[PDB]
């Protein structure tokens, strides 16, 4: 029974739980890597070794946080738990393929850990650019294991995307139009379209890197007429959509959280939120070369990519103001989830705005490959994606588990984390403006004070992570069982109780057309 | 007991055996490329084939033998196949991009020209043109098979599908002979790289597509399809038209424009 | 949200235990490695 | 069929909170420890 | 003659950040010109502009590699 | 050939509590055990290979 | 558009069989004939050890490491030239 | 070079870097205003007991929050692009210098007239002369004439590097098989420092760039002493 | 070198019945060569092979029109 249930699952809730467990464990790995980074930089000089071991840690930190922590939690975990419930469906369209999307990830993670245990690891950056990632500067199996790790993760997400799109389009009640589905369901559908289109291009690019490393192709090798910059185009054609994949499910959870704890039956401006997400998804495919403003592209190309990148601020700003307009007039419940969402709104906005600074190819000459970029993306990832994850986790944990958290502890946890992330990343703006490069194990002496403060901030975040584990333990330890939840009339996923039965919507909802 | 039309699938080991087969094939490739051994790779290929065989066997059991493919379930599988083909188009798009990137801006190592100095391309009016007529012809014969099936005609469905498979095999043998006869190789710079990786992934998809048609052929021999319900045949025809269209783009791009 | 009272309430003493065990399970193995960094670098 | 309800829809037991604390500690701790031990392995190799 | 050369002037054929082709073209032009003045009744001083421009723009290791391959018979450009 | 789909429908709808991947009878168990044995044994083998490749081999 | 012919009076199996035997397979037969004529081995070109060809950055994982997978001795030189 | 506790850009040493500082000042003002407005409005939404929870109409207000950001974006893009294009302006340099990245040092070639080249390695901390800068000094500086338009050509002989000098506003990637061009013009003599800016392996952190800007006559004397 | 010139030899760049571009190319090459030689004070005698080929191949009226347009400043080819 245990193996049938947990290794042979065809159940969207159980597979969602597996993804949440996997992603929580990956988050511990990725936190540890982040602490090693900041320990190396916490005082001037060298702690561990030269840039190789250092950048194996950097490279692994990024892959674990993105592919094994954020995407499995948001899409695999919250997506599989919530999407079928929110549309009254009895499961996903392909409930058995769904289980293979999950089970591809432990092998993917295994391949990544293998890459760092063999030879001297893949100290390439998560971008894996040739020729540094090629077979002369990174001879041996490490980079190949990293490529295969991405292949498996890619197949997992492509098949999961097919599943989500099919489920969302095909399995709603017959009366429900797409414009009657909740914003989180929209956000998952659009994320899935982005994955479907972007991951195959990454797979093509990393396969060419594999054959350049092992079959004597020369896609990226000038000696054969190839071009290292072609790899960059293929990688970023996937990699800019990838960051919108990382944030869109977060946008969808924020919409639900802000609506719920404002006491509202609906988010402000629903069709505007759908428009904004679809616009962000579309624009997210035509801007990738803002990751290449220093590679030597023609000036007109840089002008285009500057302008197109900035356009995205407009739909994104619609969502920000619509969350604010959802708060407006609310009977505000200052729950821990609400705190996470409010921190999201402000901190995501800051990171988005430094994204717009970077969009300016002229200023990006000076800021590219500095800690200013690092500050931009950790505000949107460590204080946007992660804050949405924490807000969704605290909000829906009683639905998934049947048990309540201690709200006071959860508010303490939020407070610690808020201090820690800002202490970690705000000084990185100064480091970037004043010229500290990325992917450095040590820095000229002038940069010491802010690196010291940033490393101290990373320890505060570690304390918050440890506290989170205790908080989860305490809820399962005390077993306060949920009775009643408010606002079920506009939050269908709660209406089968906590936790919902293994099979839900065996008799589907009744919705008529009139 | 349900009163929706959707399919609650029995708990299944094949997701896990498929995931592990991917682990064994990739670690297997690693062992082959770096530690001079094919053992793990052979195990993974075997478990992959076993996984695909048993998984799609079960889908046949669930649908032809148990009745679980309601119209709603079939509509979902239609969406899933189209989305899958879309992801395959974008995979090929990456290799076309690499091809145009290299051939539109040939670097000095090439001679600053395309084709590169020292490269002597196949004549696109010879076997590559024959291949084109072969795959276009198979798109005509699979369409005949489809209409015969819809019209309830067992014999002509089988004949047309057999002709389609035969043309797919002919293409594959013609391409194998062209690979052997080619005077340039995958190691001949970016010309060889784009040529063999793009047409090689296409060739693999021809083999996959032909295998799928062959499954359909044996299921048809066993009377699995009805004149109205035959989604495995529809999906294999869509996949086959995809393979035919990718070939046309290859032919115009790499063989013709690129010569 | 409303809940039933804890089936197995976790007293302040019990919480201090779980919290200390939790913190220790993160801090001790990493501390051991970091403490012994010098003993790895000369190898 | 399978068990349902709070504490029954999970692949780990919450029957005993101290057994649970041990499990969660091995679980999250093993993930957090791994990078430290991998770095140690690489520093020790050469 | 028509000298006073300081460095390679702007060349409207090659107005962008990637100057690879500008180096290659002048390398070719110089050696094409040089070959023509040797096989006929002329002198290489006419080829001098191209010589200065490519020497100015081209990495020493590119020139050295190209020179070696011309000597080897493996230079892929047409001269 | 003759149309034996009805016999297979009866076979695969028999109320014997078997999951679809075993409902064909004893050959299914065989094929399943082969598949799962190769997957788990191959995985253990792949772990052994990681162990080997993680250290310098003279 | 651009070709000719002219049915479309009602599509069915009979029409697609007509196209299969009356247009598609005859095309294949004609191209098969054309290919059977312009076959026959061309003279191979002098070997020149161009550095953008016969790339070897890592040995191939089969054979002696220096032969491509579908190596044809008659037309594929090694980095050092044609074999004996 | 950067100095302790620095918050902003290194002081501008070229006219273009001054343009960037003024452009950053403009853009950062907008960033501060928007981030602060969002923070304010959050606090404003959260500090009243008054409620309004029925359906709110969204059309009118969405004109505002689409047209206003569109205008703001245009007020950023206009100076941004102007600087972009002025960087690309034809300038007619008087000198061309090449730099080739390697693992892990830079080499320089001055081949306009003589065939001068040399390597440029970080000084190890243990060899620093007193008062010299950890991780930043090199043995052979890129001697250059001040107040003159210089063409720098950048490439690599192995993996990617990137040639940067923040106080001149320079960062050009160093890509094997590719010759990337940028223009360099210092308003002042002195020493100007930069660091490799594309991850290139074990010693990425330790292959800095040091320009030494001197009057033309002194540059000419230096070139002549290389014969 | 190659004197006892009889007529323009076969030229693999122009293997087809239409020889317009062969006449045109050699006409351009000759006048390009002559401009380069006369400028740097060399000898136009090295341009002779192009001169003989274009005179052999090109209609008199084409050469004459092209010469007239070069003198007028309306010749559309690049010299
Ligand atoms: C913003 C995220 C929250 C961050 C929380 C931590 C940071 C505090 C909030 C921070 C207080 C808000 C104002 C920003 C202070 C920056 C200091 C500065 O003079 O900036 C200078 C510039 C470069 O400027 C120069 O060329 C220097 C000329 C003047 C120098 C004078 C010398 C002495 C001045 C003393 C300043 C010491 C600062 C040390 C600061 C040390 C920090 C650890 O640097 C930069 O661009 C860095 C900015 C990156 C872009 C992000 C801005 C988004 C936040 C705005 C909303 C905050 C709302 C309140 C905040 C509400 C919180 C709920
Ligand atoms: C969740 C992840 C995430 C998200 C959502 C974004 C969103 C954005 N990012 Fe970024 N980004 C990353 C993750 C993300 N990014 C990562 C990981 C990297 C580095 C990759 C690497 O190199 O490893 C990166 C790098 C990166 C670069 C390259 C910098 C360089 O390497 O030199 C650029 C350049 O343009 C950029 C721009 C933007 C912009 C303009 C947005 C916009 O979408 C932001 C839009 C949001 C707002 C503008 C705020 C809300 C708006 C309002 C309140 C309205 C009013 C505002 C205005 C009028 C401006 N990002
Ligand atoms: C989602 C992505 C993500 C996240 C969350 C983080 C989190 C952190 N990152 Fe990350 N980082 C990257 C993605 C991320 N980073 C990327 C892509 C790069 C560039 C890589 C490269 O250059 O190639 C990078 C680079 C990078 C650098 C630069 C290295 C360099 O240039 O040399 C640094 C340095 O301080 C850093 C530090 C940190 C720190 C201190 C955190 C901390 O804030 C982390 C603190 C802890 C958490 C945020 C919690 C962890 C989450 C969980 C425990 C989930 C819990 C589960 C449930 C509730 C179910 N990161
Ligand atoms: C119709 C006839 C052709 C049929 C197809 C034949 C095989 C193609 C299989 C798949 C193609 C995928 C990998 C492409 C690799 C190159 C194979 C290209 C096709 C091919 O077979 O190319 C041959 C080289 O094969 C070689 O290197 C060795 C090839 C064997 C090793 C392949 C290992 C690489 C596997 C990487 C897989 C990545 C998968 C990613 C999926 C991710 C999904 C999200 C060319 O022979 P040659 O002697 O160089 O020149 C001929 C001279 N007479
Ligand atoms: C960089 C860019 C920065 C951009 C900053 C932009 C800030 C924009 C702010 C301006 C908002 C102006 C909106 C005005 C709409 C008011 C309509 C109204 O006032 O509300 C009513 C209808 O409301 C309805 O559907 C709608 C009810 C009111 C809701 C209208 C929208 C609410 C907006 C909230 C905004 C919160 C902050 C957003 C972020 C800035 C009409 O009321 P009356 O009393 O006539 O009759 C009603 C009562 N009787 C019973 C006595 C008759
Ligand atoms: C030399 C030999 C080498 C062989 C290598 C292995 C590769 C071969 C794989 C070939 C794919 C075979 C797929 C067979 C699918 C059979 C199951 C099937 O077709 O199932 C059908 C449903 O379709 C469905 O699931 C649709 C299922 C879609 C499957 C699509 C498969 C494409 C797979 C590509 C995978 C690799 C991609 C390439 C990456 C580089 C069942 O429904 P119906 O047909 O309506 O029947 C019901 C009626 O009987 C009722 O009256
Ligand atoms: C459905 C179609 C299936 C495919 C069938 C194959 C069709 C092939 C069309 C290919 C056209 C492009 C080929 C370009 C290659 C360069 C050829 C070229 O440039 O040729 C020029 C004319 O080109 C020209 O394509 C003129 C181009 C237009 C010619 C059109 C001819 C066919 C028209 C059919 C229209 C059908 C309707 C389509 C709409 C539905 C002639 O000058 P050269 O021959 O150089 O001679 C100079 C030398 O003799 C001496 O130096
Ligand atoms: C270097 C090597 C790296 C990669 C290694 C390989 C990794 C994976 C190992 C894969 C083994 C695959 C085993 C067979 C999978 C069959 C899946 C399938 O066919 O899934 C179907 C749904 O997807 C659909 O149709 C449409 C989609 C069908 C997908 C078929 C499998 C494709 C797997 C690879 C795809 C890669 C992406 C290609 C583009 C880059 C059926 O869904 P179920 O939930 O099962 O049932 C629903 C029931 O109602 C059926 O009666
Ligand atoms: C799951 C991560 C797995 C990564 C696998 C890395 C590749 C290892 C394959 C090689 O294994 C070893 O190779 C040796 C030399 O040939 C011998 C030995 O007997 C064999 O066992
Ligand atoms: C980046 C995340 C990590 C943050 C740092 C965690 C803070 C430290 C927590 C405790 O770590 C312990 O520290 C002891 C020292 O206080 C070590 O004992 C070591 O030192 C002792 C005192 O010198 C000896 O008694 C022991 O035998 C010797 O192993 C011990 O191994 C280690 O477990
Ligand atoms: C915690 C979860 C982590 C999962 C990730 C995988 C991490 C596995 C790392 C294992 O690291 C090895 O540990 C050995 C310890 O036995 C070391 O041997 C060393 O230490 C031994 C034991 O004291 C000596 O006997 C040996 O000679 C000496 O080389 C060895 O260098 C190191 O590579
Ligand atoms: C039950 C489910 C499946 C579990 C399967 C377990 C398979 C275990 C087989 C182990 O056999 C090993 O095979 C290695 C390769 O795999 C051999 O390396 C060899 O392989 C190479 C290639 O044939 C040669 O180059 C080398 O000389 C040589 O070390 C090695 O001797 C041998 O110990
Ligand atoms: C056996 C079957 C008769 C229909 C039935 O079983 O009742 C017939 C009908 C169509 C036949 C097939 C088709 O005519 C197409 C093929 C014709 C070739 O001669 C090879 C065998 C070939 C594959 C035939 C085998 C066999 O004779 C088939 C399969
Ligand atoms: C027409 C469509 C759907 C309306 C509906 O059927 O409910 C609505 C939803 C969101 C709307 C858009 C968003 O509100 C954002 C923009 C707002 C500007 O005021 C008009 C253009 C603008 C781009 C809007 C155009 C249009 O009214 C949209 C696209
Ligand atoms: Cu060189 Cu980084
Ligand atoms: Cu981007
Ligand atoms: Mg860079
Ligand atoms: Na350090
Ligand atoms: Na059909």
The count of other CB atoms within 10 Å of the CB of residue A270 is: 18
Catalytic residue list contains A233:
no
- The CATH number of B1-68, from 3.40.50.10310, 3.60.40.10, 3.40.462.10, 1.10.287.70, is 1.10.287.70
| CA proximity to D1, closest of A506, F37, F40, A498 | A506
Is any ligand 13 atom within 6 A of the Cβ of residue B214? no
User: Could you give the CA distance from residue I73 to residue A493 in angstroms, rounded to a whole number?
Assistant: 81
CA distance F38 to chain B (A): 7
First to last CA, chain A: 46
Q: Give chain B positions within 8 Å (CB) of E76.
A: 108-112, 116-118
**Strand, coil or helix: what is A45?**
coil
Count of A-C CB contacts under 8 Å: 63
Could you say which of A137, A271, A324 has the minimum Cβ distance to residue H201?
A: A137
Q: F56–D46: do the CB atoms touch at under 8 Å?
A: yes
Q: Is D38 within 8 Å of A35 (Cβ atoms)?
A: no
- Omega within 30 of 0 (cis) for the link into H104: yes
CA dihedral A93, A94, A98, A104 (to 10 degrees): -140
Q: Is B68 within 8 Å of A91 (Cβ atoms)?
A: no
What tokens appear for I8 in the block?
A: 């323009």
Whether E21 and chain G come into contact, CB under 8 Å, resolves to no
Sequence-ordered list of residues with C-beta below 8 angstroms from that of H225, at least 6 positions apart, any chain: none
* Domain total in chain A: 1
Is any ligand 10 atom within 6 A of the Cβ of residue C30? yes
User: Could you give the CA distance from residue A83 to residue A79 in angstroms, rounded to a whole number?
Assistant: 5
Structure solved using which method?
A: X-ray
Domains and CATH numbers, chain H: 2-91 (1.10.287.90), 92-227 (2.60.40.420)
Q: Is B186 within 8 Å of B192 (Cβ atoms)?
A: yes
| Residue labelled with tokens 């094409």 | E32
Residue nearest to atom 17 of ligand 11 (CA): D41
- Residue A152, class by beta-carbon neighbours within 10 Å (0-12 exposed, 13-18 middle, 19+ buried)? buried
CA H171 to centroid of ligand 8, rounded, Å: 45
Catalytic residue list contains A157:
yes
Domains and CATH numbers, chain D: 1-46 (4.10.49.10)
Could you say which of G35, G48, G54 has the minimum Cβ distance to residue B126?
A: G35
**Strand, coil or helix: what is B25?**
helix
Ligand 7 atom at minimum distance from I22 CA? 51
Between strands H170-174 and H161-165, the pairing is antiparallel
Q: Give chain A positions within 8 Å (CB) of F50.
A: 114, 117-118
User: Could you give the CA distance from residue B151 to residue B227 in angstroms, rounded to a whole number?
Assistant: 6
The count of other CB atoms within 10 Å of the CB of residue A338 is: 23
Ligand 10 atom at minimum distance from C29 CA? 33
Phi, psi for residue A366 in degrees, rounded to 5: -80, -25
Domains and CATH numbers, chain G: 1-84 (4.10.95.10)
What is the side-by-side strand order in the sheet with H209-214? Answer: H142-145, H209-214, H190-194
In the CATH hierarchy, which top-level class contains the domain C1-43?
A: few secondary structures
CA G43 to centroid of ligand 3, rounded, Å: 61
Sequence-ordered list of residues with C-beta below 8 angstroms from that of D37, at least 6 positions apart, any chain: C29, C33
Q: F50–A141: do the CB atoms touch at under 8 Å?
A: no
- Domain limits for position A73: 2-514
Q: Is I27 within 8 Å of I58 (Cβ atoms)?
A: yes
Is any ligand 12 atom within 6 A of the Cβ of residue B177? no
Sequence-ordered list of residues with C-beta below 8 angstroms from that of C42, at least 6 positions apart, any chain: none
| CA proximity to F35, closest of A355, H192, B49 | B49
Catalytic residue list contains A149:
no
CATH number of the domain residue A296 falls in = 1.20.210.10
Could you say which of E5, E18, E60 has the minimum Cβ distance to residue H109?
A: E60
Alpha-helical (H) ranges within B36-70 are 39-60
- Bridge partners (DSSP) of residue A140 are none
**Residue A405: how many CA atoms within 13 Å on its side-chain side?**
26
In the CATH hierarchy, which top-level class contains the domain B69-259?
A: mainly alpha
Counting DSSP H helices and E strands in chain F, the numbers are: 2, 0
Between strands H95-102 and H150-156, the pairing is parallel
**DSSP for residue H204:** G
Provide DSSP, A213-241.
HHS---TT-GGGT--HHHHHHHHHHHHHH
What's the length of chain E? Answer: 79
Mutation to probe ligand 7, out of I11, I13, I16 (largest number of atoms < 8 A from CB)? I16
Report the neighbours of C using a cutoff of 3 or more CB pairs below 8 angstroms: A, D
- Domain range summary for chain C, segments of one domain joined by +: 1-43
What tokens appear for D19 in the block?
A: 């057994």
- Residues in B whose CB is inside 8 Å of some CB of F read 10-14, 16-17, 20-21, 23-24, 27, 31, 34-35, 39-40, 43-44, 46-47, 50-51, 54, 58, 61-62, 64-67, 221-224
**Binding positions of H for Mg(2+):** 198
User: Could you give the CA distance from residue A90 to residue A78 in angstroms, rounded to a whole number?
Assistant: 16
Mutation to probe ligand 3, out of A36, A62, A416 (largest number of atoms < 8 A from CB)? A62
| CA proximity to G22, closest of G7, G36, G34 | G7
- Domain range summary for chain E, segments of one domain joined by +: 1-79
Q: Is B7 within 8 Å of B21 (Cβ atoms)?
A: no
Ligand 9 atom at minimum distance from B23 CA? 1
CATH topology of domain F1-58: Cytochrome C Oxidase; Chain J (4.10.91)
CA dihedral H176, H179, H185, H189 (to 10 degrees): 40
What tokens appear for A256 in the block?
A: 């639900």
A413 is in an annotated binding site: no
Q: Quick one: which H or E segment has residue H120?
A: strand H116-120
Q: C33–D26: do the CB atoms touch at under 8 Å?
A: no
Is any ligand 10 atom within 6 A of the Cβ of residue C35? yes
Q: Quick one: which H or E segment has residue H34?
A: helix H15-45
| CA proximity to A325, closest of H70, H34, H44 | H44
User: CA nearest C23 in A: which residue?
Assistant: A466
Q: Is H114 within 8 Å of A425 (Cβ atoms)?
A: no
Catalytic residue list contains A240:
yes
The single residue of A59, A255, A401, A458 carrying the catalytic annotation is: A255
A151 vs A18, B52, B257, CA distance in Å? 21, 19, 32
Phi, psi for residue I56 in degrees, rounded to 5: -65, -40
A368 is in an annotated binding site: yes
- List every span in chain B annotated with CATH 1.10.287.70: 1-68
| Residue labelled with tokens 């959860």 | A410
Which resolution in angstroms does this entry have? 1.8
Catalytic residue list contains A382:
no
| Residue labelled with tokens 């995958």 | B186
Residue nearest to atom 5 of ligand 14 (CA): A271
**Strand, coil or helix: what is B118?**
coil
Count of B-F CB contacts under 8 Å: 88
The count of other CB atoms within 10 Å of the CB of residue E30 is: 21
User: Could you give the CA distance from residue A304 to residue C30 in angstroms, rounded to a whole number?
Assistant: 48
**Ligand nearest to the Cα of F53, by number:** 9
| CA proximity to A114, closest of A155, A152, A75 | A152
């Amino acid at each position: 029974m245990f193996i049938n249930r947990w290794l042979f699952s065809t159940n969207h809730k159980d597979i969602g739980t597996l993804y949440l467990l996997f992603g929580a464990w990956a988050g511990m790995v990725g936190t540890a890597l982040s602490l090693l980074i900041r320990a190396e930089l916490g005082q001037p000089g060298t702690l561990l070794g030269d840039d190789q071991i250092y950048n194996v840690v950097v490279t692994a930190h990024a892959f674990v946080m993105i592919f094994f922590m954020v995407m499995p939690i948001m899409i695999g975990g919250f997506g599989n738990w919530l999407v079928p419930l929110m549309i009254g469906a009895p499961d996903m369209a392909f409930p058995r393929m769904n289980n293979m999307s999950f089970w591809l990830l432990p092998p993917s993670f295994l391949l990544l850990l293998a890459s760092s245990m063999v030879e001297a690891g893949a100290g390439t950056g998560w971008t894996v650019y040739p020729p540094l990632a090629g077979n002369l500067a990174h001879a041996g199996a490490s980079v190949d294991l990293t490529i295969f790790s991405l292949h498996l993760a890619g197949v997992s997400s492509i098949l999961g995307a097919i599943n989500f799109i099919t489920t969302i389009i095909n399995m709603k009640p017959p009366a429900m139009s797409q414009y009657q589905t909740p914003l989180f369901v929209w956000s998952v559908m659009i994320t899935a379209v982005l994955l479907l289109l972007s991951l195959p291009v990454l797979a093509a690019g990393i396969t060419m890197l594999l054959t350049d490393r092992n079959l004597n192709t020369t896609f990226f090798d000038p000696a054969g007429g190839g071009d290292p910059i072609l790899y960059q185009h293929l990688f970023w054609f996937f990699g800019h959509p990838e960051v919108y994949i990382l944030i869109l499910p977060g946008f969808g959870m924020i919409s639900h959280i802000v609506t719920y704890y404002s006491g509202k039956k609906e988010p402000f401006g629903y069709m505007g939120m759908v428009w904004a997400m679809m616009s962000i998804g579309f624009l997210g495919f035509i801007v990738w070369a803002h990751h290449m403003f220093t590679v030597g592209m023609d000036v007109d190309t840089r002008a285009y990519f500057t302008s197109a990148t900035m356009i995205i601020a407009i739909p994104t700003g619609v969502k920000v103001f619509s969350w604010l307009a959802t708060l407006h007039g609310g009977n505000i419940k200052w729950s821990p989830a609400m705190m996470w969402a409010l921190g999201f709104i402000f901190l995501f906005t800051v990171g988005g705005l430094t994204g717009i600074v970077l969009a300016n190819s002229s200023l990006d000459i000076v800021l590219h490959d500095t800690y200013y970029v690092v500050a931009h993306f950790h505000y949107v990832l460590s204080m946007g994606a992660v804050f949405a994850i924490m807000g969704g986790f605290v909000h829906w944990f009683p639905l998934f588990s049947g048990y309540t958290l201690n709200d006071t502890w959860a508010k303490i946890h939020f407070a610690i984390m808020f201090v820690g992330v800002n202490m970690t990343f705000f000084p990185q703006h100064f480091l970037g403006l004043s010229g500290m490069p990325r992917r450095y194990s040590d820095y000229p002496d002038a940069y010491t004070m802010w690196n010291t403060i940033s490393s101290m901030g990373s320890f505060i975040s570690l304390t918050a992570v440890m506290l989170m584990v205790f908080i989860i333990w305490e809820a399962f330890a005390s077993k306060r069982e949920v009775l009643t939840v408010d606002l079920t009339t506009t939050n269908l996923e709660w209406l089968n109780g906590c936790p919902p039965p293994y099979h839900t919507f065996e008799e589907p909802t009744y919705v008529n057309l009139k | 007991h349900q009163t929706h039309a959707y399919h609650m699938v029995n708990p299944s080991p094949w997701p896990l055996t498929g995931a592990l087969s991917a682990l064994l094939m990739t670690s297997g490739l690693t062992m082959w490329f770096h530690f001079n051994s094919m053992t793990l790779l052979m195990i993974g290929l075997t478990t992959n084939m076993l996984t695909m065989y048993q998984w799609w066997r079960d889908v046949i059991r669930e649908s032809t033998f148990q009745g679980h493919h309601t119209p709603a379930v079939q509509k979902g599988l239609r969406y899933g196949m189209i989305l899958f083909i879309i992801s395959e188009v974008l995979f090929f798009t990456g290799f076309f991009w690499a091809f145009y990137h290299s051939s539109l801006a040939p670097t000095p190592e090439l001679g600053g020209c395309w084709p590169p100095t020292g490269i002597h391309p196949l004549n696109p009016l010879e076997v590559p043109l024959l291949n084109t007529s072969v795959l276009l012809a198979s798109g005509v014969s699979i369409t005949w098979a489809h209409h015969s099936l819809m019209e309830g005609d067992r014999k002509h469905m089988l004949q047309a599908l057999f002709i389609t498979i035969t043309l797919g095999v002919y293409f594959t043998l013609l391409q194998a002979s062209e690979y052997y006869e080619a005077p340039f190789t995958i190691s001949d710079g970016v010309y060889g790289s784009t040529f063999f990786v793009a047409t090689g992934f296409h060739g693999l998809h021809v083999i996959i597509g032909s295998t799928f048609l062959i499954v359909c052929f044996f299921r048809q021999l066993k009377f699995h399809f009805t004149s109205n319900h035959h989604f495995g045949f529809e999906a294999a025809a869509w996949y086959w038209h995809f393979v035919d269209v990718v070939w046309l783009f290859l032919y115009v791009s790499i063989y013709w424009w690129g010569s | 949200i409303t809940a039933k009272p804890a089936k197995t309430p976790t007293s302040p003493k019990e919480q201090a235990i779980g919290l200390s065990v939790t913190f220790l399970s993160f801090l001790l193995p990493a501390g051991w490695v970091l403490y012994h960094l010098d003993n790895y670098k000369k190898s | 069929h399978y068990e349902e309800g709070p504490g029954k829809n999970i692949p780990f037991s919450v029957e005993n909170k101290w057994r649970l604390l041990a499990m969660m500690t091995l679980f999250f701790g093993s993930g957090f420890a791994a990078p430290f031990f991998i770095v140690r392995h690489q520093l020790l190799k050469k | 003659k028509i000298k006073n050369y300081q460095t390679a002037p702007f060349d409207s054929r090659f107005p962008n950040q990637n100057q690879t082709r500008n180096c290659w073209q002048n390398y070719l032009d110089f050696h094409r010109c040089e070959k023509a003045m040797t096989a006929k009744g002329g002198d290489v001083s006419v080829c001098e502009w191209y010589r200065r421009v490519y020497k100015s723009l081209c990495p020493i290791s590119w020139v050295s590699t190209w020179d070696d391959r011309r000597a080897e018979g493996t230079f892929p450009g047409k001269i | 050939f003759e149309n034996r789909v009805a016999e297979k429908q009866k076979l695969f709808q028999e109320d014997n509590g078997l999951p679809v991947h075993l409902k064909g009878g004893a050959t299914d168990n065989i094929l399943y055990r082969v598949t799962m044995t190769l997957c788990l044994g191959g995985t253990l083998y792949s772990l052994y290979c990681l162990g080997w490749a993680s250290f310098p081999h003279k | 558009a651009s070709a000719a012919k002219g049915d479309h009076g009602g599509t069915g199996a009979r029409t697609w069989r007509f196209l299969t035997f009356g247009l598609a397979l005859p095309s294949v037969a004609l191209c098969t004939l054309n290919s059977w004529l312009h076959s026959g081995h061309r003279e191979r070109p002098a070997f020149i050890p161009y550095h953008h060809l016969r790339i070897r950055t890592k040995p191939f994982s089969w054979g002696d490491g220096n032969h491509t997978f579908f190596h044809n001795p008659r037309v594929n030189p090694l980095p050092t030239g044609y074999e004996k | 070079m950067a100095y302790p506790m620095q918050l902003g850009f290194q002081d501008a040493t070229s006219p273009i870097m001054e343009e960037l500082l003024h452009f950053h000042d403009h853009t950062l003002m907008i960033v501060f205003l928007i981030s602060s407005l969002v923070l304010y409005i959050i606090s404003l939404m959260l500090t009243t007991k008054l409620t309004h929870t029925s359906t709110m109409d969204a059309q009118e207000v969405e004109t505002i929050w689409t047209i206003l950001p569109a205008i703001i974006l245009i007020l950023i893009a206009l100076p941004s692009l102007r600087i972009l294009y002025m960087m690309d302006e034809i300038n007619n340099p008087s000198l061309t210098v090449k730099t080739m990245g390697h693992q892990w040092y830079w080499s320089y070639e001055y081949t306009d007239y003589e065939d001068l080249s040399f390597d440029s390695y970080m000084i190890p901390t243990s060899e620093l002369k007193p008062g010299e800068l950890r991780l930043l000094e090199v043995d052979n500086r890129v001697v250059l004439p001040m107040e003159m338009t210089i063409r720098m050509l950048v490439s690599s002989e192995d993996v990617l590097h990137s040639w940067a000098v923040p106080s001149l506003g320079l960062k050009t990637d160093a890509i094997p098989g590719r010759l990337n061009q940028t223009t360099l013009m210092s308003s002042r003599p002195g020493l100007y420092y930069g660091q490799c800016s594309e991850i290139c392996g074990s010693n990425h952190s330790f292959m800095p760039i040091v320009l030494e800007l001197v009057p033309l006559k002194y540059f000419e004397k230096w070139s002549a002493s290389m014969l």
